[PDB]
A paper describes a structure:
The m1G37 modification also prevents the ribosome from shifting out of the three-nucleotide mRNA codon frame (‘frameshifting’) to ensure the correct polypeptide is expressed. The absence of m1G37 in tRNAPro causes high levels of +1 frameshifting on so-called ‘slippery’ or polynucleotide mRNA sequences where four nucleotides encode for a single proline codon. To address this question, here we solved six 70S structures of tRNAPro-CGG in the presence or absence of the m1G37 modification and bound to either cognate or slippery codons in the P site. We further show that ribosomes bound to mRNA-tRNA pairs that result in +1 frameshifts promoted by tRNAPro-CGG result in large conformational changes of the 30S head domain, consequently biasing the tRNA-mRNA pair toward the E site.
In an attempt to reconcile the exact role of the m1G37 modification in tRNAPro-CGG in the context of a +1 slippery CCC-U codon, we next solved a ribosome structure of this complex in the P site to a resolution of 3.2 Å. Unexpectedly, tRNAPro-CGG moves from the P site towards the E site, adopting a position on the ribosome which we refer to as e*/E (where e* signifies an intermediate position between the 30S subunit P and the E sites and E signifies a 50S E-site position). The e*/E position of tRNAPro-CGG when bound to this slippery codon is different from the classical P/P position that the same tRNA adopts when it interacts with a cognate CCG codon (compare Figure 2A with Figure 2C). Therefore, the ability of tRNAPro-CGG to move towards the E site when bound to a slippery proline codon suggests that it is this near-cognate codon–anticodon interaction alone that is sufficient to destabilize tRNAPro-CGG. The e*/E position of the tRNAPro-CGG-mRNA pair is additionally coupled to large conformational changes of the 30S head domain. The same swivel and tilting of the head domain of e*/E tRNAPro-CGG occurs but our structure lacks EF-G. This result indicates that even with the m1G37 modification, interactions of tRNAPro-CGG with the P site are destabilized when bound to a near-cognate codon, promoting its movement toward the E site along with 30S head domain swivel and tilting. In our structure containing an e*/E tRNAPro-CGG bound to a near-cognate, slippery codon, the first three nucleotides of the codon fully occupy the E site, despite the codon–anticodon adopting an intermediate position on the 30S between the P and the E sites. In our structure of tRNAPro-CGG interacting with a near-cognate, +1 slippery codon, G926 instead interacts with U+4 of the CCC-U codon rather than the third nucleotide, thereby defining U+4 as the end of the E-site codon. In our structure containing e*/E tRNAPro-CGG bound to a CCC-U codon, the G966-C1400 interaction is ablated.
Residue numbers in the entry:
A (entry chain R7): 1 to 47
B (entry chain RD): 2 to 273
The structure:
RNA sequence: GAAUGCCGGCAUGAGUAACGAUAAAGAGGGUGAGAAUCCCUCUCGCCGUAAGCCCAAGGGUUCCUACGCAAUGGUCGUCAGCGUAGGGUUAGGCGGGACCUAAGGUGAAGCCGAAAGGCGUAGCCGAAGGGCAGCCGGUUAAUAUUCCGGCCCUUCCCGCAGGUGCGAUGGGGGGACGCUCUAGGCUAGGGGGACCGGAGCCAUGGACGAGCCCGGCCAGAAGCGCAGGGUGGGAGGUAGGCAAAUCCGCCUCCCAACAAGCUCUGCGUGGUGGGGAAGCCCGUACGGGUGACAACCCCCCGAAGCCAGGGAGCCAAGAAAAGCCUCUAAGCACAACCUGCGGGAACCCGUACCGCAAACCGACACAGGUGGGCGGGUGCAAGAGCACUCAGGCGCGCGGGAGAACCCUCGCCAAGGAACUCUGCAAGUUGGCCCCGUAACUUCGGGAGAAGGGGUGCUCCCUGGGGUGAUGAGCCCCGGGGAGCCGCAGUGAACAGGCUCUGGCGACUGUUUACCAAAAACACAGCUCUCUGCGAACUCGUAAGAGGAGGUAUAGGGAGCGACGCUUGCCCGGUGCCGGAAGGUCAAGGGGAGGGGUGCAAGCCCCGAACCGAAGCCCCGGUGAACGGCGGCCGUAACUAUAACGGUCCUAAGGUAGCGAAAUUCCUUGUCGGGUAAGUUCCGACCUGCACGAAAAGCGUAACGACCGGAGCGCUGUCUCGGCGAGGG
RNA sequence: GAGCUAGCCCUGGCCAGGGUGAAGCUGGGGUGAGACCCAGUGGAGGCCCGAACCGGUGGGGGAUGCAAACCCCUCGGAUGA
RNA sequence: UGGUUCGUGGAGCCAUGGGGGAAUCUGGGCGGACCACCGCCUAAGGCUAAGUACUCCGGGUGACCGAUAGCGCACCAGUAC
RNA sequence: UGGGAGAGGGUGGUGGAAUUCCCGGAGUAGCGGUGAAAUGCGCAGAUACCGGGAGGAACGCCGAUGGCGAAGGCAGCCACCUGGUCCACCCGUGACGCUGAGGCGCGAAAGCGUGGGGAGCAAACCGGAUUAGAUACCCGGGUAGUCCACGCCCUAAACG
């Protein structure tokens, strides 16, 4: 049966991308939590 | 008149399609007019406002001239009576002698070859738009503005007709198809004659298909719902609504007058 | 020492279930220390509209080669999609970007929002939509429309050559479009050949023969040829395409009325270029050589593909922008632009491998899921079905024996056929084509495949039509008629409805509880009520704003019923709604009679009664396809019985038509009849309706239903009543 | 967080092969002209059968499964909501 | 209406959103409704270190821990998953 | 050939009296109804008076015991189209005539389908009065219907 994860680099990068997080003020604060705790990947590595 | 169907299959015994014989042999439309894409939509900023609207055949909007005073005193000859899917009323082409091409609402009796003139002149017979300060009392008229220089806003649907009953100074009273006697300005333009194709009521959709093809999605009865969404909804088998018939937002839907009573346009209204 | 406590370790179950589709294995020869599992050969089996090839996503070294087997592989392992190391992805023409725009997003101008932020015509972003220039072979272990070979093309930049008023984000043409059904000519693909070329082979009884088997193509500029698409041409006037305009549009006269001509495609032909089987010999895991001066010819079927913007019909009425052409304005007419010929320049990213799967998503080498294209041959009427089989790829990563019970899956059965049982649940019968042949009823279409029957193979003869070859042979389609043969059986295997009567409910096609409910539930056309005069009513939002709708009473919203036929009676006392500038009550405000507190005083500050004060509520009317409701008792007619009738109490009024033990009836298996031998179910009636009833509609209604209930015929392991046999455990 | 799922917008694609034979049109009959009735063409439909496809009706298996929704036989739709 | 202990309480004072709406020292505010006396300041413009709070970093100390503790990590950790 | 009469029929246009509703002016204690009253309307200002607007159905006098048509039926007026009928001439055709089973056409009112229109009248229906009772005759209201376009009904005291 069709499961929940049907990958797409386009949807992943337009949704959880850095340029999508820097626009919204909620997403800008998302990067503050990841930098101050020290995440190695602030945004999901999309290729 | 319309043509019925033999019941070769079900939903055809009742389905009746209109008469397409008055349409001239001009099935494809004319470009340089209608280059607008109809913005097919159902919501404003995503959230649905008008419920049960969707589907529907793809259409193209034909830009219609409602400002007939742009070419006052300039005659125009019709050469095509076309079908407009954005309207119940048919349309007609206007090949002006000036050279401009424009779509106009096609009233009844407007045949090919007849020419149409606009302005305070242009005698009384179909198509000729005149301001209400010059149209004779007791005549059939349509495409009426309510306020000057704003465009035709009254009696644009099929078969509708407006009749002049009197005069009040610079204002002229009108008998609208709903029966309202509204006092509109005399300088408001109006096109004589009845809109025609009065047989739009006489058609029968036959099945649910034509509703979906027109774009009307299924209308869910409010009693089949549940109390969180609709007031009528809930209870056991076939709730007899148990309260005054209301709408999903709580307001009553049977006999509650909703116009504003403090409206400044109420002093130009007489009847129902 | 305990909290179904937290973390870690090891037991029990236990050498038990399982080892992941029943598509299937066996032998011989190699390597190796170790082979059922790796390599090679032979035999066997499976898929073959895939279980085979080619793309787009996603995955991101998995590809190739050398060396390995500690871990991964449901066993082994010398193997690998695993470990170590090296190599491999080459583009002006393929795809994407220095091209365009749609939904949507962003957003200068402008509007809004306590802040964050939100809307927003123009502009921009935004794509398997438009536009654009490459086809065929060869090489590597791994790449190729990318490298090589042949042939053909596209942009710019600079020069001479010939022409012209050139000339833009601006104007106009064009780009430009639906669904169904189809004509003409071609191509892909395929069938045949007594024609051509082939190593070879006569086997086991016969056959040296028009014998068997294999193969008889691909691309290809310019001209040609065939088919097809787009297009009229002048001459005036002109107030319109938001400046100008010879372009476009509109009016008039002329010749075309054609596709003649001018263009643009497709296909065939074409200088030249390439491929080239089966069999045998080799040694690769795989390629090579030869067969090879290889032939490369003729018929037939022939598309859903090409000419493409073809044609006809229909209504539900079928994107935008740029590339291209034309027009002109500032400018410039030593410029610039068009055609043609040279020389030069042509960037950035991907190309490997998987890709109905062991590499994507499902924790797994998971029987699940995944978009497009090719998808051969024969037979069954056909077809992408079904059975077998080319090319290709596999035997699904535990096996060997045995032949218990028991379970799954499958086959057969005496005699009876529903007695089993909630129910023929399951299973079984029928089953495809052709020809007879059909009922009540009905909305005249249907019901209809009704039901129910007959023919179906092969051989011989006579014979009719088409289509392609010329008005003939061959080839390919359908027939018609007459003789005869075999078997139990002729859609001989596979795929390919059991039927009839009636009732409930819903008109019908559909839709839904992903993962227990596909239904009488939802929806549907259709009917009614009600709101709504356009800055509409209503919805979302604090607002701007947007939907409605670039709609305008034949339109839009809400509510109810839910096709169609006949109908929807009474109550407006209560509630809702509608209409009522009277009256009562009614808060802030006006108003100050009068009174108070302070001071020596003017003054200052409080209360503060009549009187005028809106909406609402009360009051008066109307409204039930609005919320809702729609009685009881007693007595009377000449066999009894009953009550057409009369009287009385109360409510605002006191169920009409139609139906009725019902999806509604408790008593109740009401009672009569029909069915059965036997009928708490079923059907037709009576009415005593606990507790039907007219739009939460009433009564019927042809057709339809994987809905529900009852009966019957054919049929069977469903049962008396079980027995046996196969495969997987 | 709408890569599952529900609806809608923009743009593309897919539905083999058989039947049924509406309207229209041509010819004939017919009338004063029609209406209308026969053939022939025609190819309509939320039409019939049935694969891909989309579902998930009935039964059996499965139940620490191949599977946290599966498999076999059967079944509904398959030019349209 | 908010703030202050202040919740309408006799509700002042300090800010205000709405309506009306003056004066320049014999002018105004306050001293908890209001009035008189007596006293305190002189509003509707603004600037200002010091002393005060905190620990990403460095140092010192510890009747603080010692790999199931101590920060989530003494170890290439906000990693693998 | 030449004239005539006629409410013959179909379409379009158009006029006035009156009813009803609305707006305005002015006016007060009732109006209405019947054999009699009552329901009802009326201090929230009605009936009656005047002015203006709206809308529909019928056409007063002429108008008749009249006319026209096969029948049902047909009345303000104008215009268009087309029936039928009468008179004078003796011209033409030369019996071409009469009736008519079946068929076809028309066919009042009421009724049915779709849509419009709806002033008045008015089945069903509410209320008052009458009567012993009154599902009625009388009175206050009131829907379908009366009208129009098309389609269907196709009956009758369709009666000379
Ligand atoms: Mg354009
Ligand atoms: Mg938007
Ligand atoms: Mg948004
Ligand atoms: Mg519900
Ligand atoms: Mg609620
Ligand atoms: Mg109930
Ligand atoms: Mg309820
Ligand atoms: Mg109730
Ligand atoms: Mg109103
Ligand atoms: Mg203890
Ligand atoms: Mg312990
Ligand atoms: Mg433990
Ligand atoms: Mg053990
Ligand atoms: Mg055990
Ligand atoms: Mg055991
Ligand atoms: Mg075992
Ligand atoms: Mg296995
Ligand atoms: Mg297995
Ligand atoms: Mg071996
Ligand atoms: Mg070794
Ligand atoms: Mg096979
Ligand atoms: Mg095959
Ligand atoms: Mg990729
Ligand atoms: Mg992976
Ligand atoms: Mg690797
Ligand atoms: Mg490999
Ligand atoms: Mg190993
Ligand atoms: Mg192992
Ligand atoms: Mg495994
Ligand atoms: Mg490896
Ligand atoms: Mg560039
Ligand atoms: Mg770009
Ligand atoms: Mg763009
Ligand atoms: Mg846009
Ligand atoms: Mg924005
Ligand atoms: Mg925005
Ligand atoms: Mg925009
Ligand atoms: Mg493209
Ligand atoms: Mg390209
Ligand atoms: Mg080429
Ligand atoms: Mg490869
Ligand atoms: Mg020159
Ligand atoms: Mg130029
Ligand atoms: Mg240019
Ligand atoms: Mg343009
Ligand atoms: Mg052909
Ligand atoms: Mg070829
Ligand atoms: Mg061929
Ligand atoms: Mg051959
Ligand atoms: Mg040879
Ligand atoms: Mg022999
Ligand atoms: Mg051949
Ligand atoms: Mg010109
Ligand atoms: Mg101009
Ligand atoms: Mg000129
Ligand atoms: Mg060619
Ligand atoms: Mg050739
Ligand atoms: Mg060769
Ligand atoms: Mg190989
Ligand atoms: Mg196709
Ligand atoms: Mg095409
Ligand atoms: Mg076309
Ligand atoms: Mg652009
Ligand atoms: Mg100049
Ligand atoms: Mg560059
Ligand atoms: Mg490549
Ligand atoms: Mg490749
Ligand atoms: Mg598969
Ligand atoms: Mg799983
Ligand atoms: Mg495996
Ligand atoms: Mg798998
Ligand atoms: Mg997997
Ligand atoms: Mg698939
Ligand atoms: Mg595929
Ligand atoms: Mg094929
Ligand atoms: Mg085949
Ligand atoms: Mg065949
Ligand atoms: Mg098969
Ligand atoms: Mg059998
Ligand atoms: Mg037996
Ligand atoms: Mg037997
Ligand atoms: Mg039997
Ligand atoms: Mg029994
Ligand atoms: Mg038993
Ligand atoms: Mg029994
Ligand atoms: Mg049963
Ligand atoms: Mg069964
Ligand atoms: Mg059989
Ligand atoms: Mg019968
Ligand atoms: Mg029939
Ligand atoms: Mg039947
Ligand atoms: Mg049969
Ligand atoms: Mg025979
Ligand atoms: Mg034989
Ligand atoms: Mg022949
Ligand atoms: Mg036989
Ligand atoms: Mg089967
Ligand atoms: Mg069948
Ligand atoms: Mg039934
Ligand atoms: Mg019944
Ligand atoms: Mg149903
Ligand atoms: Mg159907
Ligand atoms: Mg069906
Ligand atoms: Mg579903
Ligand atoms: Mg479910
Ligand atoms: Mg869920
Ligand atoms: Mg659930
Ligand atoms: Mg179903
Ligand atoms: Mg608006
Ligand atoms: Mg709001
Ligand atoms: Mg409505
Ligand atoms: Mg219902
Ligand atoms: Mg019903
Ligand atoms: Mg009722
Ligand atoms: Mg009431
Ligand atoms: Mg009342
Ligand atoms: Mg009340
Ligand atoms: Mg007061
Ligand atoms: Mg005093
Ligand atoms: Mg009041
Ligand atoms: Mg007696
Ligand atoms: Mg009685
Ligand atoms: Mg009754
Ligand atoms: Mg009963
Ligand atoms: Mg009985
Ligand atoms: Mg039983
Ligand atoms: Mg019964
Ligand atoms: Mg009874
Ligand atoms: Mg009752
Ligand atoms: Mg009921
Ligand atoms: Mg009801
Ligand atoms: Mg019934
Ligand atoms: Mg029925
Ligand atoms: Mg169904
Ligand atoms: Mg069903
Ligand atoms: Mg058995
Ligand atoms: Mg056994
Ligand atoms: Mg066995
Ligand atoms: Mg989605
Ligand atoms: Mg396909
Ligand atoms: Mg026919
Ligand atoms: Mg169908
Ligand atoms: Mg199932
Ligand atoms: Mg189910
Ligand atoms: Mg099961
Ligand atoms: Mg069967
Ligand atoms: Mg079926
Ligand atoms: Mg089907
Ligand atoms: Mg406070
Ligand atoms: Mg306070
Ligand atoms: Mg203030
Ligand atoms: Mg004070
Ligand atoms: Mg004090
Ligand atoms: Mg100051
Ligand atoms: Mg400061
Ligand atoms: Mg400071
Ligand atoms: Mg400080
Ligand atoms: Mg630790
Ligand atoms: Mg330790
Ligand atoms: Mg008056
Ligand atoms: Mg006459
Ligand atoms: Mg009548
Ligand atoms: Mg009627
Ligand atoms: Mg009816
Ligand atoms: Mg009366
Ligand atoms: Mg009356
Ligand atoms: Mg009649
Ligand atoms: Mg009779």
């Amino acid at each position: 049966m069709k499961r929940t994860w049907q990958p797409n680099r386009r949807k992943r990068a337009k949704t959880h991308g850095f340029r999508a997080r820097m626009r919204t003020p909620g997403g800008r604060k998302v990067l503050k939590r990841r930098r101050q705790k020290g995440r190695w990947r602030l945004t999901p590595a999309v290729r | 008149a319309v043509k019925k169907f033999k019941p070769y299959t079900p939903s055809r015994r009742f389905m009746t399609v209109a008469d397409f014989s008055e349409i001239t042999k001009t099935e494809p439309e004319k470009s340089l007019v209608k280059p607008l894409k109809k913005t097919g939509g159902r919501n404003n900023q995503g959230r649905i406002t008008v419920r049960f609207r969707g589907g529907g055949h793809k259409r193209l909007y034909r830009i219609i001239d409602f400002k007939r005073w742009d070419k006052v005193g300039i005659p125009a000859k019709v050469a095509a009576i076309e079908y407009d899917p954005n309207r119940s009323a048919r349309i007609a082409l206007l090949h002006y002698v000036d050279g401009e091409k424009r779509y106009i609402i096609a009233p009844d009796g407007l045949q090919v070859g007849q020419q149409v003139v606009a302005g305070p002149d242009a005698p009384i017979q179909v198509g000729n738009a005149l301001p209400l300060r010059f149209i004779p009392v007791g005549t059939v008229v349509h495409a009426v503005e309510l306020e000057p220089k704003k465009g035709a806003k009254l009696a644009r649907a099929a078969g509708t007709s407006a009749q002049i009953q009197g005069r009040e100074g610079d204002y002229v009273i009108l008998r609208l198809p709903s029966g309202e006697l509204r006092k509109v300005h005399g300088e408001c333009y109006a096109t004589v004659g009845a809109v025609g194709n009065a047989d739009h009521k006489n058609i029968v959709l036959g099945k649910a298909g034509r509703s979906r093809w027109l774009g009307r999605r299924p209308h869910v009865r409010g009693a089949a719902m549940n109390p969180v969404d609709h007031p009528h909804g809930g209870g056991e088998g076939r709730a007899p609504r148990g309260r005054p018939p209301a709408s999903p937002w709580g307001w009553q839907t049977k006999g509650l007058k909703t116009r504003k009573r403090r409206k400044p346009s109420s002093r130009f209204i007489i009847a129902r």
